[PDB]
């Protein structure tokens, strides 16, 4: 596309500049162009990809919720039309991310740290599609998260931040999307407890990384119990 003529390294550099400038649409477009160079992404580059699209879809989700709420309360065509406009834009972003994962980030990801990361993203962006959808979208989210969980439990320690963030998101999928609040609560507790028992093996910096995400599991359990 329009980033085809820019060097991979220049795209990565500009993604980091756009992050500093809080220009997340640009950041996402730079990272899409880097992915489309066809090379695998490093850990830092995967994180740039995810942060970029998470910020873009987050603005869309927030706006969609405002509009959906106004629409529900109002129940002219304008509120429905504009909610649909934002909804379609959100679906388009989700489709773009899923497209990058399917062509060809996941199939070329052999290491656990990269394969789990991408499968988690796949679960997340189908979850964002499910928020606005439906049964098949939910099963697509579930399937991606489950594959990621199975790999993470065999190949990563229970304190691994990627594993922790995956379990966090899968628990929210259970609570809100799958209407399985007991599964959500069970997952959050087991994940928290198995991480707690492994903190003693960590350096100070790794301890900080793992406990930050453990605090998110705790925040959810507090809202859920």
């Amino acid at each position: 596309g329009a980033m085809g003529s820019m060097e991979r390294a220049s795209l990565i550099q500009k993604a980091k500049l756009a992050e500093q400038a809080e220009r997340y649409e640009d950041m996402a477009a730079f990272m899409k162009g880097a992915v489309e160079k066809g090379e695998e992404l490093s850990c830092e580059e995967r994180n740039l990809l995810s942060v970029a699209y998470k910020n873009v879809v987050g603005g869309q989700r927030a706006a969609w919720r405002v509009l959906s709420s106004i629409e529900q309360k109002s129940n002219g065509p304008e509120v429905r039309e504009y909610r649909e406009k934002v909804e379609t834009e959100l679906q388009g972003v989700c489709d773009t991310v899923l497209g990058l994962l399917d062509s060809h980030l996941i199939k070329e990801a052999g290491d656990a740290e990269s394969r789990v990361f991408y499968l988690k993203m796949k679960g997340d962006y189908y979850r964002y599609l499910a928020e606005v959808a439906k049964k098949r979208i939910i099963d697509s989210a579930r399937s991606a998260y489950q594959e990621a969980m199975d790999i993470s439990k065999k190949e990563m320690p229970p304190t691994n931040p990627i594993r922790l963030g995956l379990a966090l998101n899968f628990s929210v999928f259970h609570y809100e999307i799958a209407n399985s609040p007991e599964e959500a609560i069970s997952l959050a507790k087991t994940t928290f407890d198995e991480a707690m028992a492994d903190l003693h093996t960590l350096s100070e910096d790794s301890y900080k990384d793992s406990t930050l995400i453990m605090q998110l599991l705790r925040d959810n359990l507090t809202l859920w119990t």
Binding site: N55, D124, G165, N169, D219
Partner: peptide
């Protein structure tokens, strides 16, 4: 809507 904690930027 009440939004629960998920990984990464809290951008919504």
């Amino acid at each position: 809507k009440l939004m629960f904690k998920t990984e990464g930027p809290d951008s919504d």
